[PDB]
């Protein structure tokens, strides 16, 4: 059974049933599987009646709340990563590059 948090990557957002879900791939455990077999995940909203879109290629934290079952995952929030040599936050708040130059 899977109990803690895990790091995943968003794959797709086109839900065949229409219940506003997204497809995820856990990094390390779901390696080597075709994209048509990955499970669909739901998310925790920030407020009532609000929807925050997900784009393919994002990094997130995923947890399985239903008795550790891997078929029904849950998305908690976004994750930090610095694999490219700089953190994944805007460069104005870190100082690793030159950001937006207003006219």
């Amino acid at each position: 059974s899977l109990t803690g948090k895990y790091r995943a990557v968003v794959i797709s957002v086109d839900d065949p049933k229409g219940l506003m879900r997204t497809q995820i791939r856990v990094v390390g455990m779901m390696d080597g599987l075709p994209d048509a077999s990955l499970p669909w995940a739901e998310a925790i909203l920030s407020n009532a009646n609000t929807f925050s879109p997900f784009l393919p290629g994002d990094k997130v934290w995923v947890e399985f709340p239903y008795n550790g079952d891997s078929r029904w995952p849950l998305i908690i929030g976004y994750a930090q990563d610095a694999s490219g040599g700089a953190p994944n936050v805007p460069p104005e708040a870190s100082g690793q590059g030159e950001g937006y130059v207003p006219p």
Binding site: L19, M29, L33, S37, L38, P39, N67, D69
Partner: protein
């Protein structure tokens, strides 16, 4: 390549239960084996074996090289005794310590050993019928099934045994599993209660036309096994809400799969009642239904009504020493 060769004509000897043991194309002399214990369980824990071989010259382990990964060819049968059956199986050795000029060999059945290997990579079956999953997981056994109705989704993670998914399928379908003698078996629980017996076992009757029980144990602890299944199942479904199933006066317990058919069969099992020891019948396999008649041996020959008429076999253990061949069985009733 592997070649199929004919049996040799130098083996003229017939035994009780264990007929011959070979490693490849070489034979271990049968007179050197002093113990044998063969176990056929009623779930997917696979048939097991254990041989005690007398080795004072340091030959079995030293020169034959018996360790992890040795494949034994064992011929088991009883072509003359109570049940005239005969079959051959292959076993996989896990360990073999040597003590006091003796070697104890612990073996597992190869087709089930391949099913008890942790998975290097994860496999998911999305919207597949159970037959395809069973065929893909165990492509070496014949499938004997009668209780497959719908289609669903199953998941096998990294480091998990393939037997877990098969047990989950059994629970979702409501059947009984056991792999023995080259087959894998799925048999429904509702149809087992209406099956006619095939053998008759009697006690305290010396004019019987069937067989005879020598020792038996009566278990009256039916709460010990019903305690774990006294719950009302509930689960969450995104389009229906909260889904319940089961009784109305029992405590609630949450699961994950919101499937009404899977929820309904969550609390089905077989309740053990009796243990008995007989004189070496090799036709006793799990799934068999027997008729049991027990007479009392004092007072006035009153029949014991506490033992039901028809029972199902759950576990079987066969045991041969250097003088006698014995069997032991565990019998139960469908809830």
């Amino acid at each position: 390549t592997k070649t199929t060769t004919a049996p040799e004509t130098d083996s003229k000897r017939t035994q009780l239960f264990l007929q011959s043991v070979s490693i490849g194309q070489n034979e271990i002399p049968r007179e050197m084996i002093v113990g044998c214990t063969y176990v056929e369980p009623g779930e997917l824990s696979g048939p097991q074996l254990m041989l005690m071989i007398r080795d004072s010259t340091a030959y079995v382990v030293n020169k034959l090289g018996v360790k992890f990964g040795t494949i034994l060819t064992v011929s088991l049968g009883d072509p003359e005794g109570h049940g005239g059956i005969l079959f051959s199986e292959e076993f996989f050795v896990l360990k073999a310590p040597r003590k006091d000029d003796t070697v104890l060999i612990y073996a597992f059945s190869n087709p089930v050993r391949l099913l008890k290997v942790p998975s290097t990579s994860a496999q998911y079956f999305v919207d597949k019928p159970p037959s395809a999953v069973v065929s893909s997981l165990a492509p070496g056994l014949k499938v004997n099934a009668d209780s497959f109705r719908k289609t669903s989704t199953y998941h096998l993670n990294v480091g998990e045994k393939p037997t877990k998914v098969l047990q989950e399928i059994a629970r979702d379908t409501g059947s009984m599993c056991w792999a023995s003698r080259g087959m894998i078996n799925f048999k429904s629980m509702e149809k087992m209660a209406n099956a006619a017996p095939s053998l008759t076992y009697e006690s305290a009757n010396p004019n019987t036309s069937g067989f005879t029980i020598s020792q038996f144990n009566i278990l009256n602890a039916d709460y010990e096994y019903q305690r774990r299944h006294n719950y009302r199942m509930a689960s969450y479904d995104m389009t229906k809400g909260v889904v319940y199933s089961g009784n109305q006066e029992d405590p609630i317990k949450f699961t994950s799969n919101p499937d009404p058919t899977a929820l309904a069969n969550y609390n089905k099992f077989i309740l053990p009642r009796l243990d008995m020891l007989v004189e070496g019948n090799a036709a006793l396999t799990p799934g068999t239904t027997l008729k049991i008649v027990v007479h009392n041996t004092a007072g006035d020959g009153e029949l014991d009504e506490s033992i039901p008429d028809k029972m199902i076999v759950m576990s079987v253990t066969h045991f041969e020493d250097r003088f006698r061949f014995v069997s032991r069985a565990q019998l139960g009733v469908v809830n």
